[PDB]
Ligand binder design. Structure first.
Ligand SMILES: [Mg+2]
Ligand SMILES: [Zn+2]
Lengths: 62, 213, 136, 101
RNA sequence: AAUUCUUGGACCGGCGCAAGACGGACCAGAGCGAAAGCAUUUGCCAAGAAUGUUUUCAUUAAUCAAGAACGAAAGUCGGAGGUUCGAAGACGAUCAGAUACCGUCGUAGUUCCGACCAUAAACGAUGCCGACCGGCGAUGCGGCGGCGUUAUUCCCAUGACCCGCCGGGCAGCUUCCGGGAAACCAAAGUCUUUGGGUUCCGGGGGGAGUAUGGUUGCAAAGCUGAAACUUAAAGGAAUUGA
RNA sequence: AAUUAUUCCCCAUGAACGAGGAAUUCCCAGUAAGUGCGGGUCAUAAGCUUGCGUUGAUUAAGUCCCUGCCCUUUGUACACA
């Protein structure tokens, strides 16, 4: 599947077992309106880019 | 050490003229090896097809049962057996703070077929209603149920099976009952929940081949 | 081994009865009639341990073998008839229901129409276990 | 000592209510004593929906739901954390917990 | 996990047939009943509270020793039935042991008809009748008044909502009515400012609901029911700890 | 006063050890670690400890999953608990 860019728009909350994954609201650079929720490792900032291997799957919001 | 699907003929299934999409799908049978015959073993198979698939595209919550009452040649000819609403629909309708009214009539068509029709209807909450409940008193319930039976009998009794299926393809019976019971207590989610087949007349072929065009 | 349907567009439909108890999973394809069986791969045929007959894993293996087995006979798409145990017992499907339905969609089949067909009784016979239930 | 006013149950002016089998055990609890719960669930969980949204023959077929009504005995309800113990003051609060999302 | 079931095709899918149980969701702090209790449709039979009344009789009433009707479940005797479940049983596990909890079968029973039985945390742990004493919003049945919406299109008139009022009923929230050891209670109030009427019944804890007689029962057992002896506490609500 | 070599020096002898099993420790900035220099003991005297500077990072700005301890609610026939 083509690799697609999701842009962090608003960092929401921290998740995982040991508080290790930042759960972030992403706004797609490809489609104008589609905004999904993704679990992300490492430190992430409000207003930067992610390279998603799939642009359809969504993580369970808490 | 015998591949058991080597001796299997596929047969195309045909629905009667009352539906848009004719052919339902395919059916497996064993080749006539010994005394027991492919077509005779194939005769009396019940196919439960959703009306969405049976028409082109519509309601998917109403299902029709169809019996292969005869086989002409590489073609199963099905005929209306029964009808049933889907679990999802019936479970979704039945919700709390209202009265559920159920009727059943044992009525016979002009030709041999004697059906058992089950009607269901739920008391509707008014547009400006502030009272939570919206229940019907017992005499209001059995006046509604008496009227349910009176329409359900009248609609089938006087015409033949080709026309009763033409009424069950929409829900003309349920819409007629719903409008009729507006004075006693306004119902909303009124359908003919289920149609059963108790008796058929002794099989004819000329009567089948009028239903198959 | 020859469904004489058209190569381009024509989908040949089966119907898959996924009986998912809390200690076994069945995946069982038949005719639209429901009379003639094509496949039946249980959760227990695949794995050899009693404690994981009702596994998402075992149900995933079972649905994969069913998908592969029915692709050869020429069943392209499937209608679905999911059920728990029912009667007096549980009416929530087993933990293998999800993984099996997922598995024969990951394995390149087509999904027609789905519905619950659990034996829901009007009112039933007395349930197993005493008046005081299953105490543990 | 008297703990509840309505003796842990929603019977007031009957005398007898027919019992029900618990859905975890098969323990006989009265119809109104039991902790009832109505689970409306999608057949396919969360991610399976996307795989069956693409590998479906039809055009926007709103895949069906699973309606299951569950009766728990008080012990089964507390053990499964369907209910919990409460303060003497909070016990009287009958307004069910908010389900905003 | 094993006991058990199965290539003499079990479990699974399909179409039929038979049997005996039970009446899901709708089903609620809703209804009815003296209490136990009572839920698929329709018909027949007799009864009933509440409301309505410018009808009738005119004290006929309230509570009750004796005596009497009904009385869940289990239990007993005789007949019919035996699908599910299942005391005793038989094994399979678990454990130090397990005569248990867990599992596989499973007899009496579970169901109906006719005779006994008469006890339950039979509970509101709260006799029945009558009067007075705060507030509020719902709810079920009956009656009454009232903008308007809606179904009979043809709207008079009937139902479905809407807003109040009156009488009974299941309840609810609130309060320095007042009471109480407190918990809590519009009754558990109107109690040292003690009397409206009337039935049952308690007198520190054990022995003991035991022995003995008498009585009812086919039996199990029911009703009535002590003493010697023993003991400084047992107990009820609430507080701080652990 | 040195054999059971106090220490130090000179030549000769050249062992295992090829990055370490279960398990487990300390640590977020001039910090970890590498590196040496002083103080203590001290007639003799640092593989220890207590201080000092020099070179100088990777990772993280989070959580209750693990191990601890601490609180609130609830239950009690416990109160030398
Ligand atoms: Mg009772
Ligand atoms: Zn339980």
């Amino acid at each position: 599947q083509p690799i697609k860019l999701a842009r962090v728009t608003k960092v929401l909350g921290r998740t995982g077992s040991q508080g290790q994954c930042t759960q972030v609201r992403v706004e797609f650079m490809d489609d104008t309106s589609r905004s999904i929720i993704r679990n992300v490792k490492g430190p992430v900032r409000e207003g930067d880019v992610l390279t998603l291997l799939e642009s359809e799957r969504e993580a369970r919001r808490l | 050490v015998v591949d058991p699907f080597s001796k299997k003929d596929w047969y195309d299934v045909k629905a009667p003229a009352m539906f848009n999409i004719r052919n339902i799908g395919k059916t497996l049978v064993t080749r006539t090896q010994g005394t027991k015959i492919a077509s005779d073993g194939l005769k009396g198979r019940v196919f439960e097809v959703s009306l969405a698939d049976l028409q082109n595209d519509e309601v998917a919550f109403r299902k029709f049962k169809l019996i292969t009452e005869d086989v002409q040649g590489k073609n199963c000819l099905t005929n209306f057996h029964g009808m049933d609403l889907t679990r999802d629909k019936m479970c979704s309708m039945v919700k709390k703070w209202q009265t559920m009214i159920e009727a059943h009539v044992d009525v016979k068509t002009t030709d041999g077929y004697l059906l058992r029709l089950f009607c269901v209807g739920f008391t509707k909450k008014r547009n400006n209603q502030i009272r939570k409940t919206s229940y019907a008193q017992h005499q209001q319930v059995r006046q509604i149920r008496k009227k349910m039976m009176e329409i359900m009998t009248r609609e089938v009794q006087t015409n033949d099976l080709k026309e009763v299926v033409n009424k069950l393809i929409p829900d003309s019976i349920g819409k007629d009952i719903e409008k009729a019971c507006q004075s006693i207590y306004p119902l909303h989610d009124v359908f003919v929940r289920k149609v059963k087949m108790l008796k058929k007349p002794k099989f004819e072929l000329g009567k089948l081949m009028e239903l198959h065009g | 081994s020859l469904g004489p349907q058209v190569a381009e567009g024509e989908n040949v439909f089966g119907v898959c009865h996924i009986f998912a108890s809390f200690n076994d999973t069945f995946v069982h394809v038949t005719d639209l009639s429901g009379k003639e069986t094509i496949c039946r791969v249980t959760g227990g045929m695949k794995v050899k341990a009693d404690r994981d007959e009702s596994s998402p894993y075992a149900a995933m293996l079972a649905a994969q073998d069913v998908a592969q087995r029915c692709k050869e006979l020429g069943i392209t798409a499937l209608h679905i008839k999911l059920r728990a145990t029912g009667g007096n017992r549980t009416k929530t499907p087993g933990p293998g229901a999800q993984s099996a339905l997922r598995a024969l969609a990951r394995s390149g089949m087509k999904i027609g129409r789905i519905e619950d067909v659990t034996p829901i009784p009007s009112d039933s016979t007395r349930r197993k276990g005493g008046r005081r239930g299953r105490r543990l | 000592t008297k703990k509840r006013r309505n003796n842990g149950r929603a019977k007031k002016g009957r005398g007898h209510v027919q019992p029900i089998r618990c859905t975890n055990c098969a323990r006989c609890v009265p119809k109104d004593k039991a902790i009832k719960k109505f689970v409306i669930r999608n057949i396919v969980e969360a991610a399976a929906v996307r795989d069956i949204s693409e590998v479906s023959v039809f055009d926007a077929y709103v895949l069906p739901k699973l309606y299951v009504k569950l009766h728990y005995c008080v012990s089964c309800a507390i053990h499964s954390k369907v209910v919990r113990n409460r303060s003497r003051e909070a016990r009287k609060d009958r307004t069910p917990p908010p389900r905003f999302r």
